[PDB]
Amino acid sequence: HWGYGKHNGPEHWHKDFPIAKGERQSPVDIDTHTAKYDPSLKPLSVSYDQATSLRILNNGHAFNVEFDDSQDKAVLKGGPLDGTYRLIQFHFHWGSLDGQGSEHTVDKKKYAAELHLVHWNTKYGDFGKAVQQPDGLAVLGIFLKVGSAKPGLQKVVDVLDSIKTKGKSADFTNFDPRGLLPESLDYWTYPGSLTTPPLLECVTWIVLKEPISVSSEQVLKFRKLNFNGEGEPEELMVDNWRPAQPLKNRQIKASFK
Ligand SMILES: Cc1cc[nH]c(=S)c1
Ligand SMILES: [Zn+2]
C-alpha cells in the first residue's frame, strides 16, 4: 500500500491513483510575485467558538484530531468560498529536519511543517459525498516555523506518546483549535486536491501567509511517532509530505496587497 518511503512514496502513487498526474494536484509552490491580489476576495470567517474535538488517531500516515461534524459547530466561510464548510479534522505534515516538512512552499521556501484544517461543504450532506465534488472541501493550510513554542499546540504534543503507532487513538475532547491560528488571516487561494491518496480534486485551498512558530521540542515530539503498528519494526513518522506539483492551468490569488 502507499506511504512515504522509496518504494511506495509520492513517485509511486500514480500507479494506483492515476489522478496523481491530474490537472489540479496539490501541493504547489506559491510564487509570491506571480500571485495577484484579488480585491473581490472576502475576509475569511473562521468560526471555531463551538468546536467539539473528540479523538486523536495515528492513521499510519499522520495523526488526525477529529471533531464532531454532525452539526454546524466549527465552520469556515467567506474568503473564496460560497457556502458553509464544517471542520471534520486537522492534521500535520512534517520533516525529519527543521528545513523541510511543509507541502506548500513560498518562493520555493520549505517550512518545518504544515497544518491542514479540513472542512467539507455542508450542501453535500456528508464528507464522503463532498469528496466527489470539485467544491467539496476547503482546507486551511498554516505553516509552522521553528522558533518560540506555540502554547496552543502543547496539548497535542503531550498526547502523542499515547498514540505512538498505527491504529492507536486517544480521547481528545475539549481542544480549542483557535490556539493554532496565527494573528493574520491574509491568505493565498487556489483549486487543488488532497495531498495523499486518493488525491481527489475537491479542495479549495486557503493557505495563510503568516506562519505560526513552534519550538524545536514540539516538532521533535512529532518525529517520535511511528508509521508502523505496535509489534512491528520501528519506522519513525517523519517526512510525511508530498512535494510541490505542477501548477498547470491555475492562478493563485492573494487576499492582501
Ligand atoms: C481530507 C484529507 C485527508 C488527508 N490529508 C489531507 S491534506 C486532506
Ligand atoms: Zn494534509
PDB file of C-alpha atoms and ligand atoms in Angstrom:
ATOM      1  CA  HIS A   1       0.000   0.000   0.000  1.00  0.00           C
ATOM      2  CA  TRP A   2       1.041   3.583  -0.342  1.00  0.00           C
ATOM      3  CA  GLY A   3       3.290   5.510   2.026  1.00  0.00           C
ATOM      4  CA  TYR A   4       6.193   7.912   2.075  1.00  0.00           C
ATOM      5  CA  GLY A   5       9.156   5.571   1.529  1.00  0.00           C
ATOM      6  CA  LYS A   6      11.388   4.946  -1.534  1.00  0.00           C
ATOM      7  CA  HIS A   7       9.261   2.093  -2.591  1.00  0.00           C
ATOM      8  CA  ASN A   8       5.721   3.357  -2.006  1.00  0.00           C
ATOM      9  CA  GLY A   9       6.067   7.156  -1.775  1.00  0.00           C
ATOM     10  CA  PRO A  10       4.853  10.079  -3.929  1.00  0.00           C
ATOM     11  CA  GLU A  11       6.697   8.955  -7.084  1.00  0.00           C
ATOM     12  CA  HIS A  12       4.741   5.689  -6.986  1.00  0.00           C
ATOM     13  CA  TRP A  13       1.247   6.884  -6.129  1.00  0.00           C
ATOM     14  CA  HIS A  14       0.138   7.382  -9.715  1.00  0.00           C
ATOM     15  CA  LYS A  15       0.125   3.656 -10.412  1.00  0.00           C
ATOM     16  CA  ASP A  16      -2.822   3.078  -8.034  1.00  0.00           C
ATOM     17  CA  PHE A  17      -4.171   6.701  -8.152  1.00  0.00           C
ATOM     18  CA  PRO A  18      -3.761   7.995 -11.696  1.00  0.00           C
ATOM     19  CA  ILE A  19      -5.208  11.395 -10.723  1.00  0.00           C
ATOM     20  CA  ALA A  20      -1.746  11.927  -9.146  1.00  0.00           C
ATOM     21  CA  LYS A  21      -0.853  13.340 -12.581  1.00  0.00           C
ATOM     22  CA  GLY A  22      -4.064  15.341 -12.930  1.00  0.00           C
ATOM     23  CA  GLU A  23      -4.794  18.963 -13.664  1.00  0.00           C
ATOM     24  CA  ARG A  24      -5.355  20.254 -10.198  1.00  0.00           C
ATOM     25  CA  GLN A  25      -2.962  18.453  -7.846  1.00  0.00           C
ATOM     26  CA  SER A  26      -1.641  19.733  -4.517  1.00  0.00           C
ATOM     27  CA  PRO A  27       0.570  20.981  -3.038  1.00  0.00           C
ATOM     28  CA  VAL A  28       2.148  23.703  -5.226  1.00  0.00           C
ATOM     29  CA  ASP A  29       4.782  26.288  -4.888  1.00  0.00           C
ATOM     30  CA  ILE A  30       3.315  29.740  -4.167  1.00  0.00           C
ATOM     31  CA  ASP A  31       5.284  32.209  -6.300  1.00  0.00           C
ATOM     32  CA  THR A  32       4.508  35.439  -4.369  1.00  0.00           C
ATOM     33  CA  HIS A  33       5.487  37.626  -7.295  1.00  0.00           C
ATOM     34  CA  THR A  34       3.036  35.819  -9.682  1.00  0.00           C
ATOM     35  CA  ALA A  35       0.045  35.601  -7.286  1.00  0.00           C
ATOM     36  CA  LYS A  36      -2.269  38.500  -7.947  1.00  0.00           C
ATOM     37  CA  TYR A  37      -4.213  40.382  -5.268  1.00  0.00           C
ATOM     38  CA  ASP A  38      -7.953  39.800  -5.908  1.00  0.00           C
ATOM     39  CA  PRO A  39      -9.883  42.691  -4.360  1.00  0.00           C
ATOM     40  CA  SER A  40     -13.179  40.734  -4.757  1.00  0.00           C
ATOM     41  CA  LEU A  41     -11.944  38.060  -2.211  1.00  0.00           C
ATOM     42  CA  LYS A  42     -13.587  38.445   1.184  1.00  0.00           C
ATOM     43  CA  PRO A  43     -12.093  38.131   4.553  1.00  0.00           C
ATOM     44  CA  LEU A  44     -12.087  34.650   5.743  1.00  0.00           C
ATOM     45  CA  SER A  45     -14.582  33.801   8.537  1.00  0.00           C
ATOM     46  CA  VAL A  46     -13.265  31.188  10.872  1.00  0.00           C
ATOM     47  CA  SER A  47     -15.987  30.327  13.394  1.00  0.00           C
ATOM     48  CA  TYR A  48     -14.485  27.837  15.895  1.00  0.00           C
ATOM     49  CA  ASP A  49     -16.124  29.053  19.124  1.00  0.00           C
ATOM     50  CA  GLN A  50     -18.346  25.999  19.219  1.00  0.00           C
ATOM     51  CA  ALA A  51     -15.757  23.385  18.011  1.00  0.00           C
ATOM     52  CA  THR A  52     -16.183  19.946  19.597  1.00  0.00           C
ATOM     53  CA  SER A  53     -12.966  17.852  19.399  1.00  0.00           C
ATOM     54  CA  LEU A  54     -13.344  14.161  20.047  1.00  0.00           C
ATOM     55  CA  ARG A  55     -10.380  11.918  19.435  1.00  0.00           C
ATOM     56  CA  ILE A  56      -6.840  11.828  18.118  1.00  0.00           C
ATOM     57  CA  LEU A  57      -5.852   8.943  15.858  1.00  0.00           C
ATOM     58  CA  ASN A  58      -2.436   7.777  14.447  1.00  0.00           C
ATOM     59  CA  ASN A  59      -3.600   6.514  10.995  1.00  0.00           C
ATOM     60  CA  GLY A  60      -0.172   5.263   9.877  1.00  0.00           C
ATOM     61  CA  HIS A  61       0.484   8.441   7.766  1.00  0.00           C
ATOM     62  CA  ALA A  62      -0.150  11.264  10.216  1.00  0.00           C
ATOM     63  CA  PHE A  63      -2.289  11.885  13.285  1.00  0.00           C
ATOM     64  CA  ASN A  64      -5.793  13.273  12.928  1.00  0.00           C
ATOM     65  CA  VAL A  65      -7.533  15.343  15.594  1.00  0.00           C
ATOM     66  CA  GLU A  66     -11.235  14.635  14.835  1.00  0.00           C
ATOM     67  CA  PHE A  67     -14.237  16.857  15.519  1.00  0.00           C
ATOM     68  CA  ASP A  68     -17.988  16.394  15.759  1.00  0.00           C
ATOM     69  CA  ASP A  69     -19.201  17.436  12.356  1.00  0.00           C
ATOM     70  CA  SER A  70     -22.812  16.267  12.776  1.00  0.00           C
ATOM     71  CA  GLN A  71     -23.952  19.948  13.156  1.00  0.00           C
ATOM     72  CA  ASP A  72     -22.570  23.358  12.247  1.00  0.00           C
ATOM     73  CA  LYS A  73     -20.246  23.747  15.296  1.00  0.00           C
ATOM     74  CA  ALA A  74     -16.935  24.809  13.788  1.00  0.00           C
ATOM     75  CA  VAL A  75     -17.199  26.320  10.304  1.00  0.00           C
ATOM     76  CA  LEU A  76     -15.253  28.149   7.693  1.00  0.00           C
ATOM     77  CA  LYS A  77     -16.913  30.543   5.289  1.00  0.00           C
ATOM     78  CA  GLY A  78     -16.175  33.687   3.339  1.00  0.00           C
ATOM     79  CA  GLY A  79     -12.866  34.162   1.638  1.00  0.00           C
ATOM     80  CA  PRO A  80     -13.112  32.484  -1.787  1.00  0.00           C
ATOM     81  CA  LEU A  81     -15.951  30.172  -0.564  1.00  0.00           C
ATOM     82  CA  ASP A  82     -19.630  30.038  -1.364  1.00  0.00           C
ATOM     83  CA  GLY A  83     -21.417  28.422   1.410  1.00  0.00           C
ATOM     84  CA  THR A  84     -20.510  26.819   4.716  1.00  0.00           C
ATOM     85  CA  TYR A  85     -17.848  24.279   5.312  1.00  0.00           C
ATOM     86  CA  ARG A  86     -17.737  22.168   8.561  1.00  0.00           C
ATOM     87  CA  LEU A  87     -14.495  21.247  10.301  1.00  0.00           C
ATOM     88  CA  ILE A  88     -14.019  17.473  10.372  1.00  0.00           C
ATOM     89  CA  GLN A  89     -10.339  17.028  11.322  1.00  0.00           C
ATOM     90  CA  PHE A  90      -6.936  18.574  11.376  1.00  0.00           C
ATOM     91  CA  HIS A  91      -3.540  17.014  10.863  1.00  0.00           C
ATOM     92  CA  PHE A  92       0.060  17.993  10.036  1.00  0.00           C
ATOM     93  CA  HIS A  93       2.803  17.144   7.612  1.00  0.00           C
ATOM     94  CA  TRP A  94       6.405  17.490   8.844  1.00  0.00           C
ATOM     95  CA  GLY A  95      10.032  16.770   8.177  1.00  0.00           C
ATOM     96  CA  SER A  96      12.942  14.798   9.659  1.00  0.00           C
ATOM     97  CA  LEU A  97      14.895  18.131   9.798  1.00  0.00           C
ATOM     98  CA  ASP A  98      13.675  21.705  10.507  1.00  0.00           C
ATOM     99  CA  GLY A  99      14.495  22.784   6.904  1.00  0.00           C
ATOM    100  CA  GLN A 100      11.816  20.608   5.305  1.00  0.00           C
ATOM    101  CA  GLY A 101       8.310  19.293   6.059  1.00  0.00           C
ATOM    102  CA  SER A 102       5.792  21.612   4.520  1.00  0.00           C
ATOM    103  CA  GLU A 103       3.829  20.596   1.464  1.00  0.00           C
ATOM    104  CA  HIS A 104       3.197  24.067   0.035  1.00  0.00           C
ATOM    105  CA  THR A 105       6.268  26.174  -0.401  1.00  0.00           C
ATOM    106  CA  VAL A 106       6.529  30.017  -0.684  1.00  0.00           C
ATOM    107  CA  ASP A 107       9.031  31.164  -3.306  1.00  0.00           C
ATOM    108  CA  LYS A 108      10.478  27.647  -3.001  1.00  0.00           C
ATOM    109  CA  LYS A 109      10.944  28.027   0.781  1.00  0.00           C
ATOM    110  CA  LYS A 110      10.049  24.941   2.819  1.00  0.00           C
ATOM    111  CA  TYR A 111       8.775  25.286   6.333  1.00  0.00           C
ATOM    112  CA  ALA A 112       9.310  22.723   9.120  1.00  0.00           C
ATOM    113  CA  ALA A 113       5.714  21.563   8.998  1.00  0.00           C
ATOM    114  CA  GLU A 114       2.228  22.429   7.688  1.00  0.00           C
ATOM    115  CA  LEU A 115      -1.136  22.199   9.496  1.00  0.00           C
ATOM    116  CA  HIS A 116      -4.236  21.252   7.455  1.00  0.00           C
ATOM    117  CA  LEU A 117      -7.683  22.060   8.912  1.00  0.00           C
ATOM    118  CA  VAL A 118     -10.079  20.074   6.703  1.00  0.00           C
ATOM    119  CA  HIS A 119     -13.636  21.231   6.165  1.00  0.00           C
ATOM    120  CA  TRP A 120     -16.467  19.884   3.945  1.00  0.00           C
ATOM    121  CA  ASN A 121     -19.236  21.770   2.106  1.00  0.00           C
ATOM    122  CA  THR A 122     -22.479  21.218   4.021  1.00  0.00           C
ATOM    123  CA  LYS A 123     -24.528  21.439   0.722  1.00  0.00           C
ATOM    124  CA  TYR A 124     -23.262  17.813   0.088  1.00  0.00           C
ATOM    125  CA  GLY A 125     -24.563  16.391   3.397  1.00  0.00           C
ATOM    126  CA  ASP A 126     -21.533  14.320   4.414  1.00  0.00           C
ATOM    127  CA  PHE A 127     -17.824  14.161   3.920  1.00  0.00           C
ATOM    128  CA  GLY A 128     -17.900  11.110   1.660  1.00  0.00           C
ATOM    129  CA  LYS A 129     -20.322  12.850  -0.773  1.00  0.00           C
ATOM    130  CA  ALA A 130     -18.369  16.122  -0.558  1.00  0.00           C
ATOM    131  CA  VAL A 131     -15.102  14.430  -1.756  1.00  0.00           C
ATOM    132  CA  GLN A 132     -16.851  13.533  -5.027  1.00  0.00           C
ATOM    133  CA  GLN A 133     -17.358  17.232  -5.841  1.00  0.00           C
ATOM    134  CA  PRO A 134     -14.938  19.874  -7.237  1.00  0.00           C
ATOM    135  CA  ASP A 135     -16.063  22.283  -4.473  1.00  0.00           C
ATOM    136  CA  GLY A 136     -16.496  19.691  -1.731  1.00  0.00           C
ATOM    137  CA  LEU A 137     -13.653  20.603   0.626  1.00  0.00           C
ATOM    138  CA  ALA A 138     -11.922  23.691   1.961  1.00  0.00           C
ATOM    139  CA  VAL A 139      -8.546  23.114   3.584  1.00  0.00           C
ATOM    140  CA  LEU A 140      -6.988  25.910   5.662  1.00  0.00           C
ATOM    141  CA  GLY A 141      -3.194  25.465   5.472  1.00  0.00           C
ATOM    142  CA  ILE A 142      -0.926  27.043   8.066  1.00  0.00           C
ATOM    143  CA  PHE A 143       2.902  26.862   8.007  1.00  0.00           C
ATOM    144  CA  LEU A 144       4.999  26.045  11.075  1.00  0.00           C
ATOM    145  CA  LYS A 145       8.437  27.526  11.601  1.00  0.00           C
ATOM    146  CA  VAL A 146      10.698  26.536  14.437  1.00  0.00           C
ATOM    147  CA  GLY A 147      11.347  29.293  16.996  1.00  0.00           C
ATOM    148  CA  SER A 148       9.264  30.039  20.109  1.00  0.00           C
ATOM    149  CA  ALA A 149       6.759  27.426  21.374  1.00  0.00           C
ATOM    150  CA  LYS A 150       3.130  27.592  20.332  1.00  0.00           C
ATOM    151  CA  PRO A 151       1.243  27.225  23.596  1.00  0.00           C
ATOM    152  CA  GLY A 152      -1.996  26.103  21.920  1.00  0.00           C
ATOM    153  CA  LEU A 153      -0.136  23.173  20.337  1.00  0.00           C
ATOM    154  CA  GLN A 154       1.162  21.731  23.552  1.00  0.00           C
ATOM    155  CA  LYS A 155      -1.857  19.587  24.434  1.00  0.00           C
ATOM    156  CA  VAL A 156      -1.442  17.849  21.044  1.00  0.00           C
ATOM    157  CA  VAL A 157       2.315  17.280  21.634  1.00  0.00           C
ATOM    158  CA  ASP A 158       1.534  15.969  25.219  1.00  0.00           C
ATOM    159  CA  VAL A 159      -0.788  13.185  23.942  1.00  0.00           C
ATOM    160  CA  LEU A 160       1.462  11.765  21.134  1.00  0.00           C
ATOM    161  CA  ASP A 161       3.148   9.258  23.471  1.00  0.00           C
ATOM    162  CA  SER A 162      -0.243   7.561  23.828  1.00  0.00           C
ATOM    163  CA  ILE A 163      -0.757   7.134  20.078  1.00  0.00           C
ATOM    164  CA  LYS A 164       2.741   6.216  19.033  1.00  0.00           C
ATOM    165  CA  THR A 165       1.821   3.526  16.491  1.00  0.00           C
ATOM    166  CA  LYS A 166      -0.537   2.994  13.636  1.00  0.00           C
ATOM    167  CA  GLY A 167      -4.178   2.393  14.688  1.00  0.00           C
ATOM    168  CA  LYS A 168      -3.831   3.817  18.202  1.00  0.00           C
ATOM    169  CA  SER A 169      -6.272   6.529  19.256  1.00  0.00           C
ATOM    170  CA  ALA A 170      -6.913   8.525  22.416  1.00  0.00           C
ATOM    171  CA  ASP A 171      -9.655  10.773  23.800  1.00  0.00           C
ATOM    172  CA  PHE A 172      -9.092  14.301  22.751  1.00  0.00           C
ATOM    173  CA  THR A 173     -12.084  16.273  23.872  1.00  0.00           C
ATOM    174  CA  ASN A 174     -12.130  19.968  24.798  1.00  0.00           C
ATOM    175  CA  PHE A 175      -9.317  21.018  22.453  1.00  0.00           C
ATOM    176  CA  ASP A 176      -9.699  24.587  21.052  1.00  0.00           C
ATOM    177  CA  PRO A 177      -8.231  24.813  17.535  1.00  0.00           C
ATOM    178  CA  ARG A 178      -8.268  28.631  17.709  1.00  0.00           C
ATOM    179  CA  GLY A 179      -4.968  28.262  19.555  1.00  0.00           C
ATOM    180  CA  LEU A 180      -3.246  27.037  16.384  1.00  0.00           C
ATOM    181  CA  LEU A 181      -4.030  30.162  14.307  1.00  0.00           C
ATOM    182  CA  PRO A 182      -1.576  32.993  13.557  1.00  0.00           C
ATOM    183  CA  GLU A 183      -2.652  36.619  14.120  1.00  0.00           C
ATOM    184  CA  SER A 184      -3.363  37.474  10.492  1.00  0.00           C
ATOM    185  CA  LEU A 185      -5.873  35.652   8.242  1.00  0.00           C
ATOM    186  CA  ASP A 186      -4.252  37.044   4.993  1.00  0.00           C
ATOM    187  CA  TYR A 187      -4.153  34.114   2.574  1.00  0.00           C
ATOM    188  CA  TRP A 188      -3.464  32.749  -0.859  1.00  0.00           C
ATOM    189  CA  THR A 189      -6.115  30.568  -2.553  1.00  0.00           C
ATOM    190  CA  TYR A 190      -6.205  28.136  -5.433  1.00  0.00           C
ATOM    191  CA  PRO A 191      -8.117  24.990  -6.548  1.00  0.00           C
ATOM    192  CA  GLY A 192      -6.407  21.718  -5.769  1.00  0.00           C
ATOM    193  CA  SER A 193      -6.549  18.335  -4.269  1.00  0.00           C
ATOM    194  CA  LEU A 194      -5.963  16.099  -1.175  1.00  0.00           C
ATOM    195  CA  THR A 195      -2.159  15.646  -0.879  1.00  0.00           C
ATOM    196  CA  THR A 196      -2.375  11.930  -0.015  1.00  0.00           C
ATOM    197  CA  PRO A 197      -4.131   9.153  -1.869  1.00  0.00           C
ATOM    198  CA  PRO A 198      -6.835   9.130  -3.135  1.00  0.00           C
ATOM    199  CA  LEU A 199      -5.576  12.577  -4.233  1.00  0.00           C
ATOM    200  CA  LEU A 200      -9.146  13.727  -5.041  1.00  0.00           C
ATOM    201  CA  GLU A 201      -9.523  17.094  -6.780  1.00  0.00           C
ATOM    202  CA  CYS A 202     -12.119  18.608  -4.454  1.00  0.00           C
ATOM    203  CA  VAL A 203     -10.190  21.171  -2.428  1.00  0.00           C
ATOM    204  CA  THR A 204     -10.331  24.962  -2.288  1.00  0.00           C
ATOM    205  CA  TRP A 205      -7.016  25.627  -0.720  1.00  0.00           C
ATOM    206  CA  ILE A 206      -6.712  28.616   1.570  1.00  0.00           C
ATOM    207  CA  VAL A 207      -3.017  28.947   2.722  1.00  0.00           C
ATOM    208  CA  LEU A 208      -2.304  31.546   5.392  1.00  0.00           C
ATOM    209  CA  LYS A 209       0.630  33.912   4.739  1.00  0.00           C
ATOM    210  CA  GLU A 210       1.694  34.183   8.386  1.00  0.00           C
ATOM    211  CA  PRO A 211       3.315  31.004   9.776  1.00  0.00           C
ATOM    212  CA  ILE A 212       2.981  30.013  13.402  1.00  0.00           C
ATOM    213  CA  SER A 213       6.101  29.479  15.462  1.00  0.00           C
ATOM    214  CA  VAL A 214       6.590  26.158  17.298  1.00  0.00           C
ATOM    215  CA  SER A 215       9.553  25.102  19.389  1.00  0.00           C
ATOM    216  CA  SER A 216      12.205  22.713  18.380  1.00  0.00           C
ATOM    217  CA  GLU A 217      10.994  20.400  21.243  1.00  0.00           C
ATOM    218  CA  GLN A 218       7.397  20.458  19.929  1.00  0.00           C
ATOM    219  CA  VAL A 219       8.397  19.306  16.406  1.00  0.00           C
ATOM    220  CA  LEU A 220      10.935  16.773  17.870  1.00  0.00           C
ATOM    221  CA  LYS A 221       7.996  15.143  19.572  1.00  0.00           C
ATOM    222  CA  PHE A 222       6.117  14.820  16.301  1.00  0.00           C
ATOM    223  CA  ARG A 223       9.169  12.956  14.906  1.00  0.00           C
ATOM    224  CA  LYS A 224       8.923  10.270  17.687  1.00  0.00           C
ATOM    225  CA  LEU A 225       5.656   8.917  16.290  1.00  0.00           C
ATOM    226  CA  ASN A 226       5.769   5.767  14.235  1.00  0.00           C
ATOM    227  CA  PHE A 227       4.339   4.785  10.832  1.00  0.00           C
ATOM    228  CA  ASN A 228       4.328   1.153  11.880  1.00  0.00           C
ATOM    229  CA  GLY A 229       1.909  -0.706  14.084  1.00  0.00           C
ATOM    230  CA  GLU A 230       2.703  -1.978  17.586  1.00  0.00           C
ATOM    231  CA  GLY A 231       4.911  -5.076  17.473  1.00  0.00           C
ATOM    232  CA  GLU A 232       6.432  -4.156  14.137  1.00  0.00           C
ATOM    233  CA  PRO A 233       9.880  -2.770  13.470  1.00  0.00           C
ATOM    234  CA  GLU A 234      10.091   0.916  14.288  1.00  0.00           C
ATOM    235  CA  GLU A 235       9.801   3.362  11.423  1.00  0.00           C
ATOM    236  CA  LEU A 236       9.840   6.988  12.570  1.00  0.00           C
ATOM    237  CA  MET A 237       6.911   9.078  11.264  1.00  0.00           C
ATOM    238  CA  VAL A 238       8.896  11.800   9.535  1.00  0.00           C
ATOM    239  CA  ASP A 239       8.846  13.309   6.030  1.00  0.00           C
ATOM    240  CA  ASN A 240       5.181  12.642   5.503  1.00  0.00           C
ATOM    241  CA  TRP A 241       4.877  15.440   2.939  1.00  0.00           C
ATOM    242  CA  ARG A 242       4.263  15.375  -0.831  1.00  0.00           C
ATOM    243  CA  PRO A 243       6.464  17.757  -2.842  1.00  0.00           C
ATOM    244  CA  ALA A 244       5.129  20.569  -4.940  1.00  0.00           C
ATOM    245  CA  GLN A 245       3.224  19.565  -8.088  1.00  0.00           C
ATOM    246  CA  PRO A 246       2.910  21.334 -11.469  1.00  0.00           C
ATOM    247  CA  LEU A 247       0.643  24.391 -11.292  1.00  0.00           C
ATOM    248  CA  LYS A 248      -0.765  23.730 -14.797  1.00  0.00           C
ATOM    249  CA  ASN A 249      -3.671  25.907 -15.809  1.00  0.00           C
ATOM    250  CA  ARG A 250      -4.132  27.551 -12.368  1.00  0.00           C
ATOM    251  CA  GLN A 251      -3.855  31.026 -10.803  1.00  0.00           C
ATOM    252  CA  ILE A 252      -3.035  31.553  -7.166  1.00  0.00           C
ATOM    253  CA  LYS A 253      -4.907  34.581  -5.817  1.00  0.00           C
ATOM    254  CA  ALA A 254      -3.822  36.741  -2.815  1.00  0.00           C
ATOM    255  CA  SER A 255      -6.308  38.232  -0.351  1.00  0.00           C
ATOM    256  CA  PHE A 256      -3.826  41.004   0.508  1.00  0.00           C
ATOM    257  CA  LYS A 257      -1.764  43.702  -1.097  1.00  0.00           C
TER     258      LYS A 257
HETATM  259  C1  LIG B   1      -9.200  15.117   3.749  1.00  0.00           C
HETATM  260  C2  LIG B   1      -7.689  14.955   3.873  1.00  0.00           C
HETATM  261  C3  LIG B   1      -7.173  13.821   4.379  1.00  0.00           C
HETATM  262  C4  LIG B   1      -5.785  13.668   4.484  1.00  0.00           C
HETATM  263  N1  LIG B   1      -4.948  14.670   4.053  1.00  0.00           N
HETATM  264  C5  LIG B   1      -5.485  15.866   3.563  1.00  0.00           C
HETATM  265  S1  LIG B   1      -4.404  17.178   3.050  1.00  0.00           S
HETATM  266  C6  LIG B   1      -6.822  16.017   3.472  1.00  0.00           C
HETATM  267 ZN    ZN B   2      -2.798  17.278   4.687  1.00  0.00          ZN
END
